[PDB]
A paper describes a structure:
Here, using a mammalian recombinant expression system combined with mass spectrometry approaches, we identified N-myristoylated peptides as endogenous ligands for the chicken MHC-I-like protein YF1∗7.1. YF1∗7.1 exhibited the typical architecture of MHC-I and MHC-I-like molecules in which the heavy chain was composed of the α1-and α2-helices that formed the antigen binding groove and an α3-domain that was non-covalently associated with β2-microglobulin (β2m). As previously described in, the YF1∗7.1 antigen-binding cleft is composed of two distinct pockets that differed in size and shape and are termed A′- and F′-pockets analogous to the established nomenclature originally established for CD1 pockets. The overall pattern observed for bound acylglycines and glycine lipopeptides was that the acyl chain, which is similar in all molecules, and was inserted into the A′-pocket, where it could promote anchoring and is protected from exposure to the aqueous exterior solvent by the A′-roof, a structural modification seen in human CD1 but not MHC I proteins.
Next, to gain insight into the molecular presentation of the N-myristoylated lipopeptides by YF1∗7.1, we determined the crystal structure of YF1∗7.1 to 2.0 Å resolution that was produced in the same mammalian expression system as for the mass spectrometry analysis. The native YF1∗7.1 protein adopted a very similar overall structure compared to that of YF1∗7.1 that was produced in Escherichia coli and refolded in vitro with a root mean square deviation (rmsd) of ∼0.6 Å over 313 Cα. The high resolution of the YF1∗7.1 crystal structure enabled identification of a clear electron density emerging from the binding groove of YF1∗7.1. Our ESI-MS analysis of the produced YF1∗7.1 suggested that N-myristoyl-glycine (C14:0-gly) was the most abundant ligand within the YF1∗7.1 soluble preparation, so this ligand was then modeled within this residual electron density. The structure of the YF1∗7.1-C14:0-gly binary complex was further refined and confirmed that the C14:0-gly as the bound ligand within the YF1∗7.1-binding groove. Here, the C14:0 acyl chain was sequestered within the A′-pocket, whilst the terminal glycine headgroup was positioned towards the F′-pocket of the binding groove. The overall positioning of the C14:0-gly myristoylated lipopeptide was similar to that of the polyethylene glycol (PEG) molecule identified in the in vitro refolded YF1∗7.1 crystal structure. The C14:0 acyl chain occupied ∼70% of the A′-pocket volume and contacted the hydrophobic residues Tyr7, Leu9, Ile24, Ala43, Phe96, Tyr149 and Trp153 of YF1∗7.1 via van der Waals interactions. The carbonyl oxygen of the myristate moiety was hydrogen bonded to Tyr112.
Residue numbers in the entry:
A (entry chain A): 1 to 275
B (entry chain B): 1 to 97
Write the structure that this text describes.
């Protein structure tokens, strides 16, 4: 099948009282598998997904994250002077990782942002860079002329990331292969002669899901508002959809939920009970 | 295209009085990353709340989940208070269970 490994790195001059100034969150297929932060200074697996991890692998992750932290610290001190915008708080971010596609081919990702705006990116297929402003352009031109960054990150993305993804898919298979069926609630609130129907899917895994509103067998997508897929703390997800209808039609609308855990879609209505 | 937090408040399970649950406050789409998120019961911060490691979405905006185990009681009001430098005053997001 198709699988993804992604790392989300953040550095902050102003994280908030007691908060770490540098954080890394790692994801395999929409599941957090490990974290690092500058308070603990340790990369650690999420043991509910990876329960039997060897120490040497995670010492290596820790060593790499500590180097990332130092680099982000340098950039946060130096980039503000180069932009001539010294005052205020600042942030540095990076997202990188790899996909193994259904046909086995590999895709790499590597992008940076400063103060929440695109900075530069690296293309591991062609070993080229792009930059979003003149400060980043100077960095990009130095990196490409020297040639070291591109060799290192082609290996990092195309070899190490892939090997680590295969490792985590195997070591975390029990948690990854599991399917948790959503519990759905439909609710209605009437105000000013308008009935708003809402449909909430609680606690499903894996992440992909669809919610639709239907009447007379016809979907009403143009009138539907979706809240989005948002996480629970146990690794399942939550999602919602709402629609405004005439109060006299409340019991004619049905919320349809499709999800890998449901062999056929669930269908729920306001005013009816599901034994 | 404003960097204010977009906030949702929801429980892990559809709630029933007296049944153990988890209350969640999820804020997303904001910048800068510094943000105050407080789960409250009847205006009192809830004990045992925990916060996710800072992460972000594809457009680089930040998100954070705050959650607390709890047993919902009828007659109480649960809410999430959010403070962020894009906001002139705190904003309070009630839980509709
Ligand atoms: C799940 C937690 C463990 C994560 C381990 C992987 C850590 C990778 C950190 C890469 C640091 C990249 C900095 C950088 O690119 N600096 C640019 C420069 O200054 O040359
Ligand atoms: Cl994310």
């Amino acid at each position: 099948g198709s699988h993804s490994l992604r790392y989300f790195l953040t550095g902050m001059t102003d994280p908030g009282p007691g908060m770490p100034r540098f954080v890394i969150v790692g994801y395999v297929d929409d599941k957090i598998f490990g974290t690092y932060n500058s308070k603990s200074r340790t990369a650690q697996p999420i043991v509910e997904m990876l329960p039997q991890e060897d120490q040497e692998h995670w010492d290596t992750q820790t060593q790499k994250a500590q180097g990332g932290e130092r680099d982000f610290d340098w950039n946060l001190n130096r980039l503000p002077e180069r932009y001539n915008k010294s005052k205020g708080s600042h942030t540095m971010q990076m997202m990188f990782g790899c996909d193994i596609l259904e046909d086995g081919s590999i895709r790499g990702y590597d992008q940076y942002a400063f103060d929440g705006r695109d900075f530069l990116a690296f293309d591991m297929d062609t070993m080229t860079f792009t930059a979003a402003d003149p400060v980043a352009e100077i960095t990009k031109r130095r990196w490409e002329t020297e040639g070291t960054y591109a060799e290192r990150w082609k290996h990092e993305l195309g070899t190490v990331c892939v090997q680590n993804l295969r490792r985590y898919l195997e070591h975390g298979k029990a948690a990854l292969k599991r399917r948790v069926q959503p519990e759905v609630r439909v609710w209605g609130k009437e105000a000013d002669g308008i009935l708003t129907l809402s449909c909430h899917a609680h606690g499903f895994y894996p992440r992909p899901i669809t919610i639709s509103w239907m009447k007379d067998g016809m979907v009403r997508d143009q009138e539907t508002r979706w809240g989005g897929i948002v996480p629970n703390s146990d690794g399942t997800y939550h999602a919602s959809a709402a629609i405004d209808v005439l109060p006299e039609d409340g019991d004619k609308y049905w919320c349809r939920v499709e999800h890998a855990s449901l062999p056929q879609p669930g269908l729920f209505s306001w005013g009816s009970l599901v034994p | 295209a404003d960097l204010t937090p977009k906030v949702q408040v929801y429980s892990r399970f559809p709630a029933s009085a007296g049944t153990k649950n988890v209350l969640n406050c999820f804020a997303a789409g904001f910048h800068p990353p510094k943000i105050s998120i407080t789960l409250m019961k009847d205006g009192v911060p809830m004990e045992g709340a925990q916060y996710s490691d800072m992460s972000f979405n594809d457009d680089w905006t930040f998100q954070r989940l705050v959650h607390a185990d709890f047993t919902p009681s009828s007659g109480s009001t649960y809410a999430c208070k959010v403070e962020h430098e894009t906001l002139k005053e705190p904003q309070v997001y009630k839980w509709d269970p």
